Design a protein around this ligand. Structure first.
Ligand SMILES: C[C@H](CCOc1ccc(I)cc1)CCN1CCN(c2ccncc2)C1=O
Ligand SMILES: C[C@H](CCOc1ccc(I)cc1)CCN1CCN(c2ccncc2)C1=O
Ligand code: NA
Ligand code: NA
Ligand code: NA
Ligand code: NA
Ligand code: NA
Ligand code: NA
Lengths: 58, 242, 245, 297, 49, 242, 99, 49, 58, 48
């Protein structure tokens, strides 16, 4: 469709597949999100990454 | 007009229905989204972050609450004595309720995956010791002694420069998913037990404390997933919030 | 090789021979505001070396009964060196931070401090004990300045949230038998590109002992904990007269 | 022009925020690979150093002999939209006949969803959130009865005149959006966009909204951020005379197109007030169940 | 007007007509009038088996 | 008929809903539209047109209302004395309410952009002088003196053949948009203050008035936009309009 | 005096940085401003009354009896447009009856 | 809105009507189906025993 | 569609994108207008335009 | 707190027994003459 781009997610690293009938995108459904993940951002935010095999304190 | 015919469901309001609704502000464009650090895309990302497991969940008076965050070890009598025990059930009342994993878990009816608990020794540098940490799969009663515990999945931890050791609680279930286990027929989904024993002994020289503590940090492995979204068991409100 | 380290920025250099690596919060380095995220039109001032350097603001004493402390950023620096001046003369400010908490002891002492950074660390009150009085924390408790402030109820971080889950934030531990410092680098965190260094504290630094300090009679009982921090990529805008608050 | 070397080689101005981690696709749980006994020196996966600040990297394969398991379990139900896009109660508005509250046939509700624990605890897991929303209004009498009454809901954005009565001129609603509906019709439902002046709403704001001295009598404003105050929601019975029936309006919110940043610990003490994290000091309870001894179940 | 709510194992079962659990922030609920046609919904295969 | 099912929202009337409705007059063709000068396409076009800013908003009796349109300047004692002050907040009660920008602004919840105020000196040709017009961004209290005012954005105006000078109030905000500011927590969105000082002095020879007036004209820059349509704060009707 | 607004811009009055403005101008178009339903008429059909106690009423099509709407349109001298009219009826208490 | 017109049958509930109904659990994926012996596809299979 | 041209905007310098179901165009939605503007018409209707750099009274 | 505002080094005792403080050349003149109490304190290098 040729609608406005007022969705709160317009321009997200994860694309959505939604349904809409009005001219404003934020009225659309929630749809399906893309299944990407980045655990390391929170679980391993270390500068100099350390291997599993090796001892963490070299 | 075009021939239509209403079916059951007409007029109902389903809270989880994902439909379209009329926009109140036509041609309205939201404030652009700048870059903000720490965006999270999936709750599973949070489940892989270790949080403190209150293995020592006995003190209750306000002034001693911080003591739940750590349990002790100390010089023994070399009889492979028991140090501590707790159920591995992540979505069950107990030690796991202090972890973010345990809380997020409460928003899902079923879970599946291996868990991991990392123990960090905070004693003095001169303190040494070896511990036997075991995981007893379902059906195995609380090991009466170290010899019995040793028959299941376990790790023998040696104190040294590396302050921590990781016990993996591998996914060993009959069903692909487990629902939150609790006393009763639902104990069918119990994960098992974790017991900690003295393999050798907490040895220390003259001049160093005879008692040190261990901090447990738990989280989930990368094969962990949850399903069947549900409301948490707790509702943090008594009367109306004003 | 991961235990030794040197941090040099500005005219200041820090050394450590018992480190535990470095944490880069949320996985990203501090960066200056881009021309697309920006909104203010005036050309910013980027002092560089005169403000992005290590400042050693405070020292607390760790005791067998300490509860823990917290400092708010950039509140702690608003009155120090050239950074402080720029933060006072300007309406808008943004920057990152390199935090280096120091605490050494002996191979015979023991204890573990949890050092974390919690964005938008809003403080709550005990509500008169019974929870009927809607009290509020005073300016001296919300923005404690450089002296920081002591936690009243660490278990709930004086805000009704479990400290047991604080590790979900950028953090490090200072386990005496292992290291003598924590180092966390933090990028600018806000829902806006710039903000007031005076009215808004982007995050709080928490230093709480989870495993109590201990030692035998005869060992040095005075175990200090010092806080050193360096702003990074400092940018200021909206110039006018200096304002302290 | 720039001539001195230190200027030419400086990094002052780099707007490209270097990232240390990147998101990978994970539609299903990770599989388990086969593994065997390893009796090595130098290799030590089980040993970690939690002090560093990172979670353990030790995996099942490296701690025990594992078989191969093709994991097809989905990760779809744990996405932000899956979690939040569920309508929940965020407001209740009473319009009684003979009463102490709104006995005038109209009511003004400040748009704040922090008056309800369930919903509140969920969103407070994140510091910043940007999203659109779908609001549903369920109305009826206090017994849950449906009566032939016409109502008008109106959105009064900050700065627009708040109706002061059932007959206010503001109900002319020439610019504000209004919804006229009967209690007999199905629940009214509309889509709302992301309306903050900020790039995202934030459930926590550690600061003050204005400059100046922050004396005792003004501490009510600590933590108040206008960027979260979207306005007022007004409701009235549509008539110049009082309605014949007492009414109740329940407001449900279902977020969609959600984005969140900076996760935080989850509330573990009962909520007391909307505006703050205040807790009852005399009743600080543990996060969970307790037991008699650490060596007993 | 009635409210039907699905309480999965582990979710708080309402103990009264005024229970907080009816806030239904995560559980699926259906609000409908006896005057409306019968409510109707699709349910998936939910066993762990 | 075709199977349909009604969803919530059915039967409601949303005043901003942009839908289709049946035509009352089929095959009706409207009178052709001839050319008419001055077509406006966007309210923003009107915001760039300067209107008179009532800086001198003190007189209230009917006979002195025209005096609000202009403030005076006159020979002083060379002490960098203060001439006038006002908040730069365009959608706030005060001087800006006289401008078309301020009124149009009242129909929108949020605004963003730089503003500009052009001052026209209407004294005699033989009158000279230099003024310091400053804009003090948020947080800066009303400058106690010229020296303090001079530390912010400002312009030094020299009287001459060019009767006017333009002060630009550049957009300096923390948020991308500002909502209408007012006393209270919403003072968070305040734009700042504008103060006018004597840089030199109003000098005049023998034979010319010792007092002259200045007319302020304000409007918005080309980076100005508004959003989130709302009803104005005023409703110009007491009883029913007959 | 010329009659035109100032042409002075931010760039020429102070040292400015670069700012990529993506703020939309869509909500200030004529349709965006006016295409919002507002009250323009009220017609009473009372039983026992002084006005229309005969069960019918004639209303002269004039929308200038209501301030909010009136002030908006009077910002312009000439206006050409189509319109959507909505009629909301009920008793004076706001009750719905089978009439 | 689009011009429609309701026909007889509207609102009725036919127990054998094979229609579409809203899903209560969006994005929910059921437990995978392993191999199980003795699957029957048609009752006629049983009639021959 | 093949409908009548009774819209009040038929033949405007700004084209619209609308929705309709009836044979008369004026029954259509408001749609999206085109985003053109001409501030100069009101803000600078001078015959001999004067530069910014230069002094307005030459 | 005051000392910390200038050029400095934070020394941590460990296997490396030593640390080096550099007193960078920060003068107004290209060369300094021997400084002493009086007008010649103009050439003073500073304090450690
Ligand atoms: C989704 C709502 C805005 C809803 O806006 C409308 C607007 C019109 C209509 I009709 C219905 C709803 C905002 C919820 N938020 C934003 C953040 N916030 C908040 C509350 C308390 N403390 C911090 C933030 C809060 O309550
Ligand atoms: C949009 C309306 C015409 C509505 O016409 C109908 C026709 C049929 C129906 I059913 C509903 C409405 C005209 C409004 N106008 C045109 C200008 N005008 C007016 C009023 C007072 N003084 C000057 C002009 C005024 O009130
Ligand atoms: Na028909
Ligand atoms: Na709708
Ligand atoms: Na119609
Ligand atoms: Na219609
Ligand atoms: Na039919
Ligand atoms: Na259905």
């Amino acid at each position: 469709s040729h609608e406005n781009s007022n969705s709160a997610t317009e321009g997200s690293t994860i694309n959505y597949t939604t349904i809409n009938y009005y001219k404003d995108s934020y009225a659309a459904t929630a749809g399906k999100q893309s299944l990407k993940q980045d655990p390391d951002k929170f679980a391993n935010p270390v500068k100099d990454i350390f291997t599993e095999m090796a001892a963490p304190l070299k | 007009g075009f021939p239509t015919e209403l079916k059951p469901g007409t007029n109902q309001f389903l809270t989880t229905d994902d439909g379209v609704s009329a926009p109140i502000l036509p041609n309205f464009h939201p404030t652009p989204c700048i870059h903000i650090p720490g965006e999270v895309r999936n709750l599973l990302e949070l489940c892989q972050v270790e949080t403190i497991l209150e293995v020592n969940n006995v003190p209750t008076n306000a002034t001693s609450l911080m003591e739940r965050l750590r349990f002790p070890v100390s010089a023994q009598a070399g009889k492979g004595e028991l140090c501590a025990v707790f159920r591995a059930d992540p979505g069950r009342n107990g030690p796991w309720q202090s972890t973010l994993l345990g809380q997020l878990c409460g928003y899902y009816t079923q879970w599946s995956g291996s868990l991991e608990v990392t123990f960090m020794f905070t004693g003095s540098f001169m303190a040494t010791g070896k511990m036997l940490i075991a995981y007893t799969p379902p059906g195995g009663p609380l090991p009466k002694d170290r010899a019995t515990a040793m028959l299941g999945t376990h790790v023998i931890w040696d104190f040294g420069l590396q302050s921590s050791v990781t016990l993996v609680i591998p996914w060993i279930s009959n069903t692909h998913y487990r629902a939150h286990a609790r006393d009763g027929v639902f104990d069918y989904y119990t994960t098992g037990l974790v017991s900690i024993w003295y393999q050798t002994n907490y040895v220390v020289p003259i001049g160093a404390p005879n008692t040190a503590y261990i901090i447990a940090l738990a989280a989930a492995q990368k094969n962990f997933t949850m399903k069947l979204c549900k409301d948490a068991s707790d509702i943090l409100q008594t009367g109306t919030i004003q | 090789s991961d235990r030794v380290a040197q941090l040099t920025i500005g005219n200041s250099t820090i050394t450590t021979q018992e480190a535990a690596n470095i944490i880069v919060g949320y996985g990203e380095w501090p960066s200056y505001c881009s021309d697309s995220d920006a909104t203010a039109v005036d050309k910013p001032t980027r002092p560089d070396v005169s403000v992005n350097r290590f400042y050693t603001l405070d020292t607390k004493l760790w005791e067998k009964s300490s509860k823990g402390w917290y400092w708010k950023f950039p509140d702690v620096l608003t009155e120090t060196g050239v950074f402080g001046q720029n933060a006072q003369f300007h309406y808008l400010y943004r920057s990152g931070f390199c935090i280096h908490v120091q605490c050494n002891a002996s191979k015979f002492h023991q204890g573990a401090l949890l050092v974390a950074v919690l964005p938008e660390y809003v403080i709550g009150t005990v509500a008169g004990g019974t929870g009927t009085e809607d009290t509020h924390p005073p300016y001296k408790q919300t923005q404690p300045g450089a002296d920081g402030f002591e936690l009243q109820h660490p278990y709930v971080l004086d805000a009704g949230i479990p400290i047991s889950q604080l590790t979900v934030c950028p953090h490090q531990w200072i386990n005496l038998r292992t290291n003598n410092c924590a180092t966390i680098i933090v990028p600018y965190i806000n829902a806006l590109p710039f903000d007031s260094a005076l009215n808004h504290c982007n995050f709080g630094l928490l230093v709480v002992p989870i495993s109590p300090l201990d030692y035998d009679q005869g060992a040095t009982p005075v175990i200090p904990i010092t806080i050193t921090l360096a702003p990074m990529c400092s940018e200021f805008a909206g110039l006018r007269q200096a304002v302290t608050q | 022009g720039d001539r001195v070397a230190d200027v030419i080689e400086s990094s002052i101005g780099d707007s490209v925020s270097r990232a240390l981690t990147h998101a990978l696709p994970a539609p299903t749980g990770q599989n388990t690979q086969v593994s065997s006994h390893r009796l090595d020196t130098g290799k030590v996966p089980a040993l970690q150093a939690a002090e560093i600040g990172a979670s353990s990297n030790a995996s099942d394969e490296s701690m025990i002999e594992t078989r191969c398991v093709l994991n097809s379990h989905s990760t779809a139900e744990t996405t932000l939209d899956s979690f939040f896009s569920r309508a929940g109660l965020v407001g209740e508005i009473d319009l009684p006949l003979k009463g102490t509250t709104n006995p005038n046939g109209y009511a003004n509700w400040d748009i704040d969803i922090t008056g309800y624990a369930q919903m509140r605890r969920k969103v407070e897991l994140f510091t910043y959130m940007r999203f659109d929303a779908e609001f549903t209004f369920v109305a009826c009498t206090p017994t849950g009865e449906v009566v032939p009454q016409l109502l008008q809901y109106m959105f009064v954005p900050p700065g627009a005149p708040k109706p002061d009565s059932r007959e206010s001129l503001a109900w002319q609603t020439a610019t504000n959006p209004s919804v006229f509906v009967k209690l007999s019709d199905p629940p009214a439902q509309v889509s709302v966009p992301f309306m903050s002046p900020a790039s995202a709403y934030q459930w926590f704001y550690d600061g003050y909204p204005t400059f100046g001295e922050h004396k005792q009598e003004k501490d009510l404003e600590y933590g108040a951020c206008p960027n979260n105050m979207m306005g007022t929601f007004s409701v009235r019975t549509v008539g110049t005379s009082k309605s014949k029936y007492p009414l109740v309006v329940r407001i449900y919110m279902r977020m969609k197109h959600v984005r969140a940043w900076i996760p935080r610990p989850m509330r573990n003490q009962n909520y007391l007030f909307k505006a703050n994290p205040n807790y009852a000091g005399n009743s600080i309870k543990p996060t969970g169940a307790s037991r008699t001894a650490i060596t007993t179940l």
